[PDB]
TrEMBL record, chain C:
Belongs to the enoyl-CoA hydratase/isomerase family. The keyword Isomerase applies. It comes from the Bacteria. InterPro entries: ClpP/crotonase-like_dom_sf, Enoyl-CoA_hyd/isom_CS, Enoyl-CoA_hydra/iso, Enoyl-CoA_hydra_C. CDD domains: crotonase-like. One of its GO terms (biological process) is fatty acid beta-oxidation. Transmembrane segments: none annotated. The lineage of its organism: Bacteria, Pseudomonadati, Pseudomonadota, Alphaproteobacteria, Hyphomonadales. Keywords: Isomerase, Lyase. GO terms for molecular function: isomerase activity; lyase activity. SUPFAM superfamilies: ClpP/crotonase. This is Enoyl-CoA hydratase/isomerase family protein. Signal peptide: none annotated.
Amino acid sequence: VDLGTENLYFQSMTLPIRLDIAAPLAEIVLNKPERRNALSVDMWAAIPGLVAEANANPDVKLILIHGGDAGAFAAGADISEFETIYATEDAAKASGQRIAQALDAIENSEKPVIAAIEGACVGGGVSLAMAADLRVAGEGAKFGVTPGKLGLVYPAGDTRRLLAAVGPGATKDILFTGRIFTAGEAKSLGLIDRLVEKGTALEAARVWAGEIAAISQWSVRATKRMIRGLQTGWTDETPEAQSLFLNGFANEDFKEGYRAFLDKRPAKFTYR
Amino acid sequence: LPIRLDIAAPLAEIVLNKPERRNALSVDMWAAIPGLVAEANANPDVKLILIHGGDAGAFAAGADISEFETIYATEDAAKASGQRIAQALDAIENSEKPVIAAIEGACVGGGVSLAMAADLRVAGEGAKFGVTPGKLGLVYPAGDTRRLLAAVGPGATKDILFTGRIFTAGEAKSLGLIDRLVEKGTALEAARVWAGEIAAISQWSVRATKRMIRGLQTGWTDETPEAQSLFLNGFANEDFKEGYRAFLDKRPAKFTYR
Amino acid sequence: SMTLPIRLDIAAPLAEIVLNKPERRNALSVDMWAAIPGLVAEANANPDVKLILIHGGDAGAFAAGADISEFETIYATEDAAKASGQRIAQALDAIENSEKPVIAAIEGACVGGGVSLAMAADLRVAGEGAKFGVTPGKLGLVYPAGDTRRLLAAVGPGATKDILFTGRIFTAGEAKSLGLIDRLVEKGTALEAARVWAGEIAAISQWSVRATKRMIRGLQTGWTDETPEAQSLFLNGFANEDFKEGYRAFLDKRPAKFTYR
């Protein structure tokens, strides 16, 4: 209730990353335009909380990740932090854990996440995008994964996701060369899911998110769980898997769906 | 009959045939599938199985929604309907003899599930594809989801399942959801000639290759014994015996295994 | 020499495994399969080499399946057959598990064991006009587990079956859309394309390249994010000589001169 101080307001506005609620969407907005959204420790550390906020808010159905009005999604890592975070082995290990946690938080979001990409999406930028469920990019976006250019190695999680999306050959091409490639190529590789006109990615993501928001959220969330399960060893016989299917018939959205199909009208689903 | 088996050696055709409901899949039909598949695998004149929508101008509009009240009334009935469908799809997926789906017109919901359970898919231009449980407040089962994932990958699977959208055969093709895309109305002839190509080689090899692939998909490795011994029976069976012999005699092989 | 049916050419930073039995369109024989693991080891042992290429030399074919003239001998007895299988499996495994990455450059015929070789390499580039086929079904045999695994991983279940159930020959364009090859180039240019590609890779940190390859193979055979080898692989990223040089190069804004060999 208490209105702020001027400074408090500025601190929340100049967060290098933030959450905008516009029901039924929530938008994780990268917000360090001075550095073309280069990913810093402050940002990585904030992500798991932002994702939680969004999943906790019943008015939100879908999460978007985008680069705001910075004309870039994420231009790799903040080199100004390199001295600090790579000074010691311990600092380095911590940086890794912190990043892995952010990506895992996104990947395992109960509610689905769509990445909307314009301009530069390199290094951790690709990692973020890959952690999202869906990716849409505007023509002119540039993609690259560059640890080989530093003498590093792309982590297991990041590598697993990339592999799942584009396969072994393309994953190696990307990682062995560290090359920057175009959105059109990314599209044919299967690295992104939809390719749109330059500057329209965010609008495209929003309408797409609208399509998803209109169907049963019970189903959407369950489908996502089922897919993650299967990707990590579930089988047809696995109990969580069988029972996940069976709650399909028990939830509030299901009766409305049956009825809607019989009446030939769009479903007005209630589960939130 | 709403579903049936037509034998035309070397093919067997599982034909869906409830045109009144655009081949919407009912409990009677799902329950018949495992038997039809077995009939076909048991018959030595049959080498390849086709699944198609007959002359109903649709492959399958999925499950019969008019049965939904009954079969999903109780938790027990629901569990049974799921088991019954899963059994049909598994029966197809694990058919000793390979199965080709020939798709025209609508292939949605359980339709896609059937198609994904087949080994090969050919579709005519104008076929429409969709997977819609999200529009009913349901969830796509694990088996069905596994197969779809294996064919088109995580991004496309989610697109399909999160939107429940209907998409065209051309798009299906580029997604890798179907294997061959042909002229409208020709899918069934295309499937038949394709089946003919396969029928002409060693059926021992075909059936062994299918076993090896399923094995690998469910945890086999290079070191696995069934896998090693499957390979080695390659050199012991009658078709290879015949193949070896044919090469030595410089004549075409007449394969006998069935 | 150059009478050798298969050999290793060193041209630092590349090593080229060159198939060279043009009289049989590089059809793979037992002498050749048996030589492969050693050639791969030679190359991995030589610190001047960073990347390995496999190609069909000036024979206008990558590999035209198995040597038919050996069929009687190697498949005469069960024992001979078992041995042939082991010998081939060992060649393919040697390639697949090469510390240093391997690129296949394909022109013309790539059938049977030809495809198996190509699939064992990390990367594949092919010229238009290359022809691809996997044919054990035509002889009454079955494609081994390793070969099948790799093919499956590259093109998925539907396409793997199409290929194997029909034994049909198909074009490089189709191979490309199937994901069977990684890059498709103009006829006759595959080898040059492979070389420049290999040059791109050779220019970055070899520590990273070799680690990336290990990480991928790990993930393909059951590793998870939680797996210790995986966690510690990542962390040695920050400890090795190339990263030290990489860090310094980024700070000084200059190209890295990577030293790990």
